[PDB]
Amino acid sequence: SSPLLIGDSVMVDIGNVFTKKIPNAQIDGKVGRQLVDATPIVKSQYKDYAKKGQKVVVELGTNGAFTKDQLNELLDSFGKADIYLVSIRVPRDYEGRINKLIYEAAAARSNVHLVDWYKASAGHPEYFAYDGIHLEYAGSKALTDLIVKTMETHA
Template sequence: MKKFLFILVILVFGSGIIIAKEMFSGKVPEDIVFVGDSIMNSSKQYIGPNFKNPYFDTKISRQFSTLPGIVTKLVEDNKLKTVLVVHLGTNGKFTDKDFDYVMEMANGKDVFFMNTAHKDPWEQEVNRKLKEKVDQYPNAYLIDWYSYAKGKNEYFYKDRTHLNDKGQRYYADFLTNEIKKHYLGENNKASAPKDNSSNTQEKTIKMDKIIDLRKQ
């Protein structure tokens, strides 16, 4: 009886990441490089287990303008082997030159750019320009964090920029699913998964009823 209950709990509450890991195992590139600011930095402990041999270069208050230098170093150190995932723009705007240089250094490798969700005035300009630039390159892809997270205040601290623990977990799950859906071929430009927190609660209630019936 106890064993039965334990398995159900794992399936209900672990489906976001644990089930996804098993489903997608071995179907995405290894050695993915993740570059970001404090948003990604706070979530990397939840992202890392979902990929094989990931490499993180994240830093608090990082500007997009530092990305060309970071990517140059990654290439020189032979760390950029397969895929690059970038989440920058929270702390300021970027130039066409910055973006184009990164794509040149990527040398045909897939590059995923995650847009921003925060309260600062440059948010919309950064997101608009990211979409515009991504559309110019066949190996660049946009991950629409803005559409998924905007307005979900329960994910953020009071500054409406940095993620609390719940937000960090949803961020990691969202990012994982977007990358892995891409390599499964389900969507060329993957869309955001639904927030199933209410469904999870319903399943938990139903599970409790099942357990009660088994006791009778």
């Protein structure tokens, strides 16, 4: 079945690279999307992805901070799906606090599988454009492969 990928400008950056690799992927990316605004979209549009055996990728936080309660509300809205939750790398004061939330949710939830982009990209300045937000094409290819590899192997 088709995986759902939902996120912010980072999802926009990787969406076509991802679809070329995984042709039936469903991409929902939006520049500037805040995590709290994803939950109403999931609850109203993506109920059929919130089921056992479905796969969803969550790519949020680069374009804005969120809280633990907000993240819990989004993760709960995906039900029994396997959720691939991507850590963020962005030159913002909230980066560490939000990644802590992401690591903690992946630790505590058996259906949340960490995609640790923060750690994987530590040695790769060439993945990041000068604004610290846009991924260079090489970064989008690398993040795509990292997500796919995580989905093929799980938590």
